[PDB]
Design a protein around this ligand. Structure first.
Ligand SMILES: N[C@@H]1[C@@H](O)[C@H](O)[C@@H](COP(=O)(O)O)O[C@@H]1O
Ligand SMILES: N[C@@H]1[C@@H](O)[C@H](O)[C@@H](COP(=O)(O)O)O[C@H]1O
Lengths: 166, 164
């Protein structure tokens, strides 16, 4: 009953199409925040710099799957907030509006528990182990584009990696 | 909180690459009979003999994970004393059997700590654990191991580099 998701630099939209599921989203919160030192470092901006934060509930065939909170430089992408009225895919929006294409990313996978609000939104018991992901992505020019923190349903996901030994 | 980068490396290698000292306790080792599932994973007959190895993994001194390894008993005579000799299963495989891992599929998912696991790992029953399952094949294309590891959710982080 779990989606088996390959670990690769792909969008949620791409990932769900690969599963033969229909991706939809509910915009939970969107707006600008000021970067602290941590976030400024992750986005290569000056501390105090403005960050577009996008929080979305991602669904598959209508069922909650994940809550994603992505962070981008507002200075680099000042029309991106409005462009998400037009695009359902952030990665598509980046490519079409700004000709930005992701090339490399570091992803982390951890497990812990949801907040009460997250559990409510995902329709899971608050004691259910969840998959807490982060993704730090850079584009073809080597600039960091996004820093994402996410909560994926522990009862709906496993991730799969291919390993190679030289 | 060990942030462990993912590639086909041994626990031993992973620990040394982080300055941490790799230490393990051998909990149990013995034969089991393969069901169809395990027989498929190890390319043996549905009633064949599997070596199951249970190990406690410690990062420095503190419990980190319980690792359950499955291999074909027929293919690896005297694996028990070989593991004792080399400590690293991957070192034993290479030095003793001339078996070298080439690729693996690793699954990452969540689970809850069982009473046995909570006891061994010094944690509480029913708290989140990261569960990794590794299916590895050697340079001849044969499966070598099927491994299931349960990590303390509060101490372990899986890291992957993604490329498009
Ligand atoms: N884990 C990634 C996120 O880091 C990324 O922000 C999202 C964009 O998805 P989309 O282009 O559908 O909006 O895709 C994946 O889910
Ligand atoms: N998850 C893997 C497992 O598949 C593998 O057998 C094990 C080998 O480690 P070692 O006994 O130190 O050679 O490394 C673990 O991290």
């Amino acid at each position: 009953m779990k989606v088996s998701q390959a670990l690769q630099l792909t969008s949620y939209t791409e990932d769900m199409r690969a599963q033969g599921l229909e991706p939809t989203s509910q915009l939970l919160d969107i707006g600008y925040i000021t970067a602290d030192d941590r976030l400024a470092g992750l986005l290569d901006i000056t501390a105090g710099g403005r960050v577009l934060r996008i929080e979305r509930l991602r669904m598959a065939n209508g069922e909650p799957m994940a809550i994603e909170t992505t962070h981008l430089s507002a200075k680099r992408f000042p029309a991106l907030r409005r462009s998400l009225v037009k695009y359902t895919s952030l990665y598509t929006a980046l490519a079409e509006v700004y000709d930005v294409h992701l090339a490399e990313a570091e992803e982390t996978i951890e497990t812990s528990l949801a907040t009460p609000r997250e559990a409510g939104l995902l329709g899971t018991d608050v004691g259910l182990p969840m998959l807490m992901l982060s993704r730090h992505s850079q584009d073809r020019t080597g600039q960091p584009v996004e820093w994402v923190r996410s909560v994926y349903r522990g009862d709906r996901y496993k991730f799969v990696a291919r390993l190679k030994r030289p």
